[model samples]
Target: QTAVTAEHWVDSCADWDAWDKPGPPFRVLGNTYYVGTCGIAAILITGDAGHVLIDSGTDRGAVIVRDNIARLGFSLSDVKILLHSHEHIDHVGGMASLQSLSGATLYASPAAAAVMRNGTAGEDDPQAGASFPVARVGGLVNDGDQIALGNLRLTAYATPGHTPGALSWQWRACCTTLVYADSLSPVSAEGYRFNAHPEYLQAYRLGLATLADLECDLLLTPHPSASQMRQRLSERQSLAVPDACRQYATGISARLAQRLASEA
Candidate 1:
């Protein structure tokens, strides 16, 4: 584990308090279910063999996840693998607790595993130094790697701008391809801007393009509203939104440009 700096524990904004409250957890579709709070999202992918959990949420997240799993008629011990989109406090806070509770193998890209193991954000990551509990990564996956548990298989797409190891996932179900995109918001406490960092700027472009090419029938984000999951989840997608991925990328592109303009 990396030695954490005290500064990482400070609250930079009130977003945490608001987003920490538990949201209504429900079955997203087919075998996938939303088992997280209002602000942060944690998904449960189930199968006859066991379950796969993505993004454990905040410090209180593990407990919430436990209850939600039970509410949906599942067991924590049945969770065979735990995966993550990236290593961020909000998304990964309860990782350690959940892993201990469920005794599941946590999987992350090699790049993401380093930060996760240390419970510290990468130096270049916006939340760098933000104090968080360290978690173990038992499974190390690569960009093109695929994870199979029971009857489901998910492909990981490396999207590095938000964080070096940020990932987006794709799986087919109910005659639709579902994608859980890591957040595209260029938010960092260190004043890191996608428009300012040449490398990150390129990463953002590639990441956006990667997602744009997916046949996205249902687009879900780490944060529900970012992809309008709340509205869509309430009712099944009325029609195939093949262009949902493009629409999301467009919004992110516009946000990046606007952010750059404002900073200048």
Candidate 2:
């Protein structure tokens, strides 16, 4: 089996200073969001009742995220729900801080929640490990669970493999946009090596298949630079699936599966 090496992945846009520059708030379909280039993906979703924060930036980056949100006319308190894509430190570093500041309920996948709640050796616990502040976990979200943000409702599809409970949020109302976190990034090829866990690869392929079946007008991945919709569509120029992309996704899945099977 061909091994996936570091050369394949794209570098994170977080390293780019341009990503940090404050920009005008953009609307994707009907959802208005504030994008920051904090090396991690931070999206602020506006809801009818209030606003929903998708993922908090890195530990120190939360302040910038707060500033960006304020600039967009929404305060941290307006953030009713904080949905974490997974339990990675970069994705959820500001959970404790944000919860303390906003008093918003935290929602995460079951597997990730377990890692956060129970203080395993390397799991969440600052003293024992990295301790996430004590916040009420709203609930465990499985595939098909709808996260309603007023007029906008995003269906959570269980797309594990990158992390045990990695999730992809699907927006059906406004031209099917899948808010996929971590599973596929521009840096995916390079970062994919760190995905040593077997289940992550399995979930990644399944997630790809799941998205392929949907009427995806756009694919919104967490990594800003790895925006596949525009890049892939541009390369193909046709509505049909591009040969290179399909080959890439399928090849990666097969290679990873072989590695996992060999281990088993």
Candidate 3:
């Protein structure tokens, strides 16, 4: 699939119904749950003390996520911390509502934290200017910092390219380590090519390298479809499935190369 760009972004704005298509939520693995819509991803990570929520989609997507969480007999009040993959509106729009519902402490990378507090992204953000309601950040974390609540501990990694301060997460769940890579789409709007920005491309390569080395038994992503959400359910691949992380990154890397080729 092609990376999300300006046309897809604008078409999405015009075609609201695409995001409205509903999909039944399911358990991705152990305490990690997929409570998002067909288009957007919002994950729920549960533990004994409380729960953590990642990416609540758009404002309307928030309602479905809230309902989906409730449907699983999970209370919104149990959510202790709110986290995210990036500061894009599709991911950040529902955060204000969710924070209000759960009174959860919102944690973000230093870059994302600034955006959450001000409701604006700097010019560095590939997809800038689309703002959501401001969220008061309870914690600002840097790479390698871990946030723990009861039995759950999620470590943050600075994976910025899709947007400045894009974050990915890793935690032990379901008797194994699970990783959530924010956006490896090689995606950018017009004029935001990786070839145009050397530092951005360098950080992205490092992030991908970091991902390749993680001891992940299961890999999750913000976009459920890309995560192989359905296929993995019945016959999941083992961690020994011949370099799973590289397999995931390779496609994105190839797409990125293709983008650069077109630019050349």
Candidate 4:
């Protein structure tokens, strides 16, 4: 991929600076590495053919992610695939810039592809007005789709309700199953009700079910704290935890239930 330099993209939101604090880039296992901020998590999987990057931090965090990749001795141009967990600004704010520089092919679910094209979520999105720079999605993927770069393989799981097209990715490295699960928190914009939308609620439940059923050995999340990844990484704890994905899914499911109760 040819490199192109443009004016760096920037975004603003509450706690953006704190969330963008530089994280010491390190390997999670095998070819996988942590390349995101202390708050947000970005993962890099490198291979002989090329490299794959999952999620970029906020707009400002993109540069950080880029630096982390280079710090790990990989070229930005070598990143052939740019994947993401969701379309939320904090998770995707840096995507457009990263994609532009690497000229990488970005793939997303059709629903998220539409959001990326428009730079905002639809009315069905709980956080509709929140917007970010548009990123080009070169391909659309669905549940059960597998993305491969060289020998590295990732499976996409549709884990919506955090957003209409949120996805959690599963891959294996270092002899253990690792799931980069998306956000499952029951957050919404003002006046949005989980109990009011039966279809969305159904999708939400299915998403949680998908998470619960995954064969996951280590659980990573968009926000590191959401899955205790920050604690694990900072304390040098073992990344693998038995039933981590199932436990995470159960907690989020209960949180959604509580959210619905509050709405009633």
Candidate 5:
């Protein structure tokens, strides 16, 4: 188990206060999403067919998500699917509640399914009694599964290192937005370096390498700080990702490679 620091602890724990208070929802890339008051991240996709919820914030966040969705002229029933970045409670804390209310089909990676099934508390698990019934998990996303929302197609890339089933979704049609959750910090240009499981570091490097090749225009993180609330589609079109992002990715990969090489 990795040692828990203040940062790690805070990331693992959800802010109940923020979850209880709902805020005005915003639009990003033609998709509507709500931001948690305390610090959780929740994105609502109002697709032409039906709405799809990315993550349901924390315990208090579930109510906020439901209320926000209702405010948008849609009910819980409008939510057709619910997907998670990782299995941490802060990300999936509201899963049980949302699932009961919305009856949305849940999707997660196989590794996360293992943890959900075994009820094994990993270093990252908050052990907060948040249960995600196996029946709710309708699908297991693999490395190459393509999740399409209208014209938007996001390819699932299994990036396991931060957690056994950490995933990054790539928008191939847009070829710019990469929805990365949990493995890297939303703001840290240095990338994720602390509280990582050693066995999964190499896998993280591979994930980064794969992302670099994809050449994403923007990186969308699951944390509140990383959400694209203020972004304008026109501005996003004009803006070009700096080489610094590539350098940052390379630096992260090098660090992991060094760690792996030393062990050999």
Candidate 6:
């Protein structure tokens, strides 16, 4: 239904070039598709009114997604909305180009919108030095804001810490609840310490709590490896486990605790 052109396409950083490797797009559940890279993730949720796309992977990876979406019998024009998990290069490097190509309305949290408009992470970002292509956000969404398109309604949860504007999206689809949870790893830029910032630590814990309590029937992450995505797919383990997000939160919470201890 669409084609990948060289226009507005660029290569990713050499260190991250491997992330741009081609990943075959496949149906994850009813009306939901995985159109991302072998390393990073990008989700496409289809509807009669239009479609919603999450993440765009690296810039080069966008080419892969463009081809993958076409292989799945969809066009860029079908994408009416574009959302992301966080404001990071690996996850959003292709956002600007993809939004331009699809004419999709881009939305983000206030923090994410600021970073996107600047095309780089702010000094407050955990990864402050990271940069990416600038995306023009159309509006800002906050905690509990529901994004609707036809019968699809995605609820946004402000899950910061990984980045100040990180969000975990949830929706009911395929007779179950699906959550596109953001990365919660406590990684940060050099000279940054999580234990030293009490307010940030509080926000981080709250975000983890939100994730732990989510009614997540299925859990997806920005990075495939982060969620054991391929392993679960091969084992066909995508549904019926309501505590998927809880377990995810538990694991990440432990990791964060350990990170804070090390900082201390």
Candidate 3 wrong stretches, greater than 4 Å: 1-17, 234-242
Error at 223, model 5, angstroms: 1.3
Find the 10 residues in a row with the least total lDDT in model 2.
1-10
> Which parts of model 4 have CA positions greater than 4 angstroms off?
1-17, 234-236
lDDT, model 3: 0.76
What is the TM-score (0 to 1) of candidate 3? 0.87
- For model 5, state the Cα shift of residue 75 in Å: 2.5
RMSD of each: 8.4, 8.4, 6.6, 6.4, 9.1, 5.6
lDDT tens digits by residue: candidate 3, 196-254: 78878889888877877777667777765565544444233332244556677776777
Candidate 6 pairs with clashing backbones: none
Candidate 3 lDDT at 13 equals 26
Candidates in order have lDDT scores of 0.77, 0.54, 0.76, 0.83, 0.57, 0.83
Q: What is the C-alpha lDDT profile of model 5 across 1-264, one tens digit per residue? A: 222222332344343334444555444344544433335666676666676677776667777777767766777887777777766666776776888888888788887766555544354432322443333677888987977656445577776554667777655322335454444421111433333444555566677777556656545455543433223222233222544235445655666556445443
CA deviation > 4 Å runs, candidate 1: 1-17, 234-240
lDDT of 2 by residue, 108-165 (tens): 7787667546422232211122444434577778877887756767677776554566
- lDDT at 12, model 4: 18
Error in Å for residue 139 of model 4: 0.5
Could you tell me the C-alpha RMSD of candidate 2 in Å? 8.4
Clashes of 2: 9
Q: Model 2 reaches what TM-score against the true structure?
A: 0.68
* Clashes per candidate, residues 3 or more apart or on different chains: 5, 9, 0, 0, 3, 0
Q: Summarize candidate 6's per-residue lDDT along 67-98 as a digit string, tens digits.
A: 88998899899899999999998888889999
Candidate 3 clashes between residue pairs 3 or more apart in a chain or in different chains:
none
Higher-TM-score candidate of 2 and 4:
4
lDDT of 1 at 252: 86
